[PDB]
Write a protein that binds this ligand. Sequence first.
Ligand SMILES: COc1cccc(C=O)c1O
Ligand SMILES: [Fe+2]
Length: 525
Amino acid sequence: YVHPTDILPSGWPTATDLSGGAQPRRFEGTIFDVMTRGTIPKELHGTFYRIMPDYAQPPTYYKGGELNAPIDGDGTVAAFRFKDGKVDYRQRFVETDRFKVERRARKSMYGLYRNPYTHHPCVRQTVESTANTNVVMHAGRFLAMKENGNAYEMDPHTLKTLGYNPFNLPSKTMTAHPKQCSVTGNLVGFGYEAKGLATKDVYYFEVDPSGKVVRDLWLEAPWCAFIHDCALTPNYLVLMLWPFEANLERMKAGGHHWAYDYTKPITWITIPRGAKSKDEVKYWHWKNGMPIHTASGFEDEQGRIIIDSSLVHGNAFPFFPPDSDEQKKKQEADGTPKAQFVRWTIDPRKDNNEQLPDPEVILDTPSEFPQIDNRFMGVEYSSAFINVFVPDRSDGNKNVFQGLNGLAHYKRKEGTTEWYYAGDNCLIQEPVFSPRSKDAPEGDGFVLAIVDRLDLNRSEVVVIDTRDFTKAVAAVQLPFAIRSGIHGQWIPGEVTPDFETKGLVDLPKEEHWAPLSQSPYDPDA
Ligand SMILES: COc1cccc(C=O)c1O
Ligand SMILES: [Fe+2]
């Protein structure tokens, strides 16, 4: 059966998200008192903010949009606010400069990811960021982030866009993966390509809880590398280099910003915290592969840097292939890489010119978007909450971003892993942790994540108590599906300005519109 209206032409290209999903969503608005199944824990007090790519206009500017990447689309923030067991929701697009241009124009004006040479001539010198990767609340300011620009600030209640680069960073970029130190409260981070397209410059920074840059350093990466994420320790920021290289002449020629390079080893840059000289920075190397996201890092008793990450044994973004015909054929040959969760040891007593030890396999299954208990950010941690391909219950052939159908709770100290399965014909997104109370043990609390009910065309938020990780306590049930997203964060009420007085939805007025005389009811009747 085919419905005659279904063969009518769309002017939309295939606009995928990371999951492989291709349905544009693009709504902006609210639901007060989201339908829930089961009981919402009264211990949740805060907001789960999630950010997705969801092109607002059909991205047809360059080559009819046929090369749009899953990481490209205009950032939209879904907020799910948990107060006294009620849950409200708000979604709104980040009003990036790019968004504004395209909405006002009713027209795509931007080309390839990170390639201004493929943007419309009138926009080439704009901030090209779609601000669609990650969010943070720092020094009372709520930020949407993408690594090709500074952050945009938004109002945390209305999600109205307030401004660009609120912390006034001197770099042209900020990572979407800054870390908030649990000891100092510093937003610790960096920005690479810090001086413009294909620059090797990195700028390291620490922003104190008052919003001031208290520490910074300019340095360079050994090549212009895709430095997506990092790990924070008490004495280091550690930058994680993926084996992609940027090339200006390739960009000028209308090619991709990045090209995977099998010959590049995974490389780490140790930046001593508050370093006085770029002389203090070291490069460490292993072998080729793609560690996507760190869980976190710390320094062990002997001062060794321990980091856990996912590890994909090859290219997890095949839409950015190698330059050479030779490496192109190797990517095709390799198909879907081996995918695991691994532990790295960067011992600063050793010569950084020596190849790193092979990382230890922690989980031998496809693993991604890890989070921790943030009360342990930048110090020793045990808990990780990992998005996973469930062992024996998942495809295997799927790209790492496209078959994530469970979660894992790993605890290094106990050496145990517990597992949550999203369901048949379901996918589950990145987990976030909220502690049971202020003083609860590490990883004691509630884990939330978005579930795609693929057979129902709707999305839901599952809530799981760490005392039984196998089972959902509650499910927040949207009446629709939202885009599969990138990162999200549990943001405590206590660090949110005016969380006690402002909901995601403004209440209507108390006063009745109508006079008493209009009531159909007469108490004397
Ligand atoms: C959404 O935009 C992005 C840019 C660069 C890397 C990643 C990886 O998750 C990403 O999601
Ligand atoms: Fe990321």
